[PDB]
C-alpha cells in the first residue's frame, strides 16, 4: 500500500499522485 505502493513504484518513478497531493497541501 502507501508504502508498498511507493516501494513497488520505487524504480524509475517518484511517489506521484501522493507526493503532488502532499505537496499540494
mmCIF file of N, CA, C and O in Angstrom, residues 5-19:
data_model
loop_
_atom_site.group_PDB
_atom_site.id
_atom_site.type_symbol
_atom_site.label_atom_id
_atom_site.label_comp_id
_atom_site.label_asym_id
_atom_site.label_seq_id
_atom_site.Cartn_x
_atom_site.Cartn_y
_atom_site.Cartn_z
ATOM 1 N N UNK A 5 3.114 0.486 -2.177
ATOM 2 C CA UNK A 5 2.757 1.108 -3.440
ATOM 3 C C UNK A 5 3.943 1.926 -3.954
ATOM 4 O O UNK A 5 4.414 1.709 -5.070
ATOM 5 N N UNK A 6 4.392 2.848 -3.116
ATOM 6 C CA UNK A 6 5.510 3.705 -3.475
ATOM 7 C C UNK A 6 6.763 2.847 -3.668
ATOM 8 O O UNK A 6 7.572 3.114 -4.555
ATOM 9 N N UNK A 7 6.883 1.834 -2.822
ATOM 10 C CA UNK A 7 8.029 0.942 -2.882
ATOM 11 C C UNK A 7 8.038 0.222 -4.232
ATOM 12 O O UNK A 7 9.047 0.229 -4.936
ATOM 13 N N UNK A 8 6.904 -0.381 -4.554
ATOM 14 C CA UNK A 8 6.768 -1.100 -5.810
ATOM 15 C C UNK A 8 7.108 -0.197 -6.997
ATOM 16 O O UNK A 8 7.773 -0.628 -7.939
ATOM 17 N N UNK A 9 6.639 1.039 -6.914
ATOM 18 C CA UNK A 9 6.886 2.007 -7.969
ATOM 19 C C UNK A 9 8.144 2.817 -7.651
ATOM 20 O O UNK A 9 8.307 3.934 -8.140
ATOM 21 N N UNK A 10 9.002 2.223 -6.834
ATOM 22 C CA UNK A 10 10.238 2.878 -6.442
ATOM 23 C C UNK A 10 11.390 2.332 -7.288
ATOM 24 O O UNK A 10 12.305 1.700 -6.764
ATOM 25 N N UNK A 11 11.307 2.598 -8.584
ATOM 26 C CA UNK A 11 12.332 2.143 -9.508
ATOM 27 C C UNK A 11 12.831 3.331 -10.334
ATOM 28 O O UNK A 11 13.970 3.766 -10.175
ATOM 29 N N UNK A 12 11.953 3.821 -11.197
ATOM 30 C CA UNK A 12 12.292 4.947 -12.050
ATOM 31 C C UNK A 12 11.184 6.001 -12.033
ATOM 32 O O UNK A 12 11.019 6.750 -12.995
ATOM 33 N N UNK A 13 10.453 6.027 -10.928
ATOM 34 C CA UNK A 13 9.355 6.967 -10.778
ATOM 35 C C UNK A 13 9.142 7.308 -9.302
ATOM 36 O O UNK A 13 9.161 6.423 -8.448
ATOM 37 N N UNK A 14 8.939 8.627 -9.040
ATOM 38 C CA UNK A 14 8.723 9.096 -7.682
ATOM 39 C C UNK A 14 7.314 8.749 -7.199
ATOM 40 O O UNK A 14 6.501 8.232 -7.965
ATOM 41 N N UNK A 15 7.061 9.052 -5.898
ATOM 42 C CA UNK A 15 5.761 8.784 -5.306
ATOM 43 C C UNK A 15 4.722 9.800 -5.782
ATOM 44 O O UNK A 15 4.196 10.576 -4.985
ATOM 45 N N UNK A 16 4.456 9.764 -7.080
ATOM 46 C CA UNK A 16 3.496 10.680 -7.673
ATOM 47 C C UNK A 16 2.109 10.409 -7.085
ATOM 48 O O UNK A 16 1.943 9.503 -6.270
ATOM 49 N N UNK A 17 1.149 11.210 -7.523
ATOM 50 C CA UNK A 17 -0.221 11.055 -7.067
ATOM 51 C C UNK A 17 -0.320 11.489 -5.603
ATOM 52 O O UNK A 17 -1.160 12.314 -5.251
ATOM 53 N N UNK A 18 0.553 10.913 -4.789
ATOM 54 C CA UNK A 18 0.562 11.214 -3.367
ATOM 55 C C UNK A 18 1.506 12.382 -3.077
ATOM 56 O O UNK A 18 1.159 13.294 -2.328
ATOM 57 N N UNK A 19 2.682 12.316 -3.685
ATOM 58 C CA UNK A 19 3.684 13.349 -3.489
ATOM 59 C C UNK A 19 3.088 14.709 -3.859
ATOM 60 O O UNK A 19 3.127 15.645 -3.061
#
